[PDB]
Amino acid sequence: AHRPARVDIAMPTTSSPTAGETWLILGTDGSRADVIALVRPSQEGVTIINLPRDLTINSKGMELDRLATTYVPGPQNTVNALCTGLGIPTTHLVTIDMAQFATIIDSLGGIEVDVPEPVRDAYTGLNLSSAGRHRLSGIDALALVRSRHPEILRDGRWVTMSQADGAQRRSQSTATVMQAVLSAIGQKASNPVSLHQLAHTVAGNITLDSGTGLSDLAALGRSASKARRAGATTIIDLPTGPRDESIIVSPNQESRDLLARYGYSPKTCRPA
Template sequence: MTACLAVGADAAVLAHRPARVDIAMPSTSSAAAGETWLILGTDSRTTVPGEQSRYGTAQEVEGSRADVIALVRPSDSGVTIINLPRDLTINSRGMELDRLATTYVPGPQNTVNALCTGLGVPTTHLITIDMAQFADIIDSLGGIDVDVPEPVRDAYTGLNITSAGPHRLTGIDALALVRSRHPEILNNGTWVSMSEADGARRRSESTATVMRAALSAISQRSSNPLELHRLAHTIAGNITLDSDTGLSDLAALGRSASKSEKTGSTTLVDLPTGPRDDSIIVSPSQESRDLLARHGYTPKSCHPTGS
C-alpha cells in the first residue's frame, strides 16, 4: 500500500513538472495525417546556459524565435522526424509571407497556425524547449556523442571544436553546434568562413546529428529503471507542453522513440527546399511538397480552429 501511494505521488509530481500553454489545435480533412508532435527549440535570452555574454541579453535580442522546428511522427513502423528549416518562408496568413523562425514571435499558437495554413501540417501535440532547458537535458544524459567531419568554430555561438572525429559534447557545446549559422572550418591550416547558404545547410545537418545522438543516449539510459526515473523528471521539468497533452501522451511518445531507436527504425529527414542563395529566405520546393504529402500533409487539408 505504501509503495502504491509513493508511486502515485511520484506520478502526480511528474505530471505537474512541465509548464503549460493553451493551444487551439487545428483540424484536418486528411485521413493520413496521423499524430504529429511539433517540437520547437526557442532562442529567448531570458534564460540561457552559461555566461549571458555568449548569447546577448534579452534587451539586446528581444523576443523569442523558433530556432529548431521538428515534426515528430510516431507510428507502428517507427518514428519519423522531419526537420524544417527555420528560414523556410511560407504563406501563413492569406498572401502574407512568414519565415518559420519568426512565426513564433507572437507565440506558439501563431506557429501552429502557420504550419497548418502554409504547409498543411495539423499539430496534435506541442513541446517547446528554450536554450537553458535544452542544455540541461543534454547534460542530464552525461553529454552526447557526435562525429564531427572537420574542425569547426563559430564566434557567434561560442562553438569551438578543434579536431575532426568523435566528440562528447556538453549541453552548452551541443547548443552552440545546433545554433551555428556562421561556421568556419579548418582547411589546410586556415579557418575558412562558409557562405550563408552553406552555413544554413550545415546547421540543418548539425540539428539532425544532435537529435539522433540525444535519442540514442535516451534509449540507452531508459533500460535502467533508476536512470529512466531521473531522466523522466529532468525532461518533464525542462519542457513546456500544450495544456491538452498529458503525461500518458508523453510517456507513449517516449516508448515509441526508445523502441524505434533500439530497432533502428528512427528516420530523420531534412525537408528539401528550393535553391538557397546568400539571403535568409528559402521557399518550399516541389520535392518538399511531395515529401510532406507522403506524410498526409497537403495544402488546404488543415484548418486552424476558428477559421
C-alpha cells in the first residue's frame, strides 16, 4: 500500500538555460536539515553536490541563515533560500526523516563504510570499536551523519575535537554514506524480486512535493543506473574556504564557480 507523504511547494523560477532537472534531497532532524544534496541528472551522467549544513547564505532579500536553519519554517524556506543565496532552482523535492533514513538503509541491507579509527558519540549513540569495512545498519549510518561531537582515541583517551573538525568529519561521513547508498542501490537493482518490495518501501518512507511524480523518481533512478554503468556518477562536496579560518562559513569564489559550471547563479534565480 505504501504511498509517499506530500508537501505543497512553490518551485522557484529561473532564466538560466544550463539549470535543468535539479532534485533537492533533504535529510531531516521546528526541524533542522542535517543533509542537503542536489542531484543533477544530465546527458554527461549524474552529479551529486553535497551542500554543507553549516554554510551561511542569503536566505531572504538582505538576510543571512545557515543551510540547516532554513528548514525550521518549512521546506519552502530551504527551497527559496538556495535560490536567492546560491542560485539553485529546485525542480523536484525529496525529504527523508531519521526513521525514514534508517528504514531505507535497512531495506538495502545496510551500507559498507570504511571506518578509519574507533569513533564514538554519546549524543548520537555512535560506537565503532574498530577500523575497516563495517556494514553499518540504519541507526549506525544515522549516528555517523548526525555525529555532532565525535570522540576519538588520542594518547589512550577519548578526546573531542574542534567544531570545524566535527563538521569536516560529517561532510566526509555524509559523502561516504551517499556513495555507499548509491552503491547499495545498484547492488539491489540487479535482483528482480528485491526491487518490487524495495521500490515499494522507499515510496512509503519519503516525502515528495505535490508536483513531483512517483514516476519522475523512476526516471531519476533509471538515469542514475545508466550513469553507474557508464562510470559517469560523481559526488562532490561544495568547496568552501578553510572552516577554522573564519567565524561564519560563507560561499567563496571556488564554490561560486563549481556552482556556475552547472548553471546556478543567484542573479538568474527567483522564488514564488
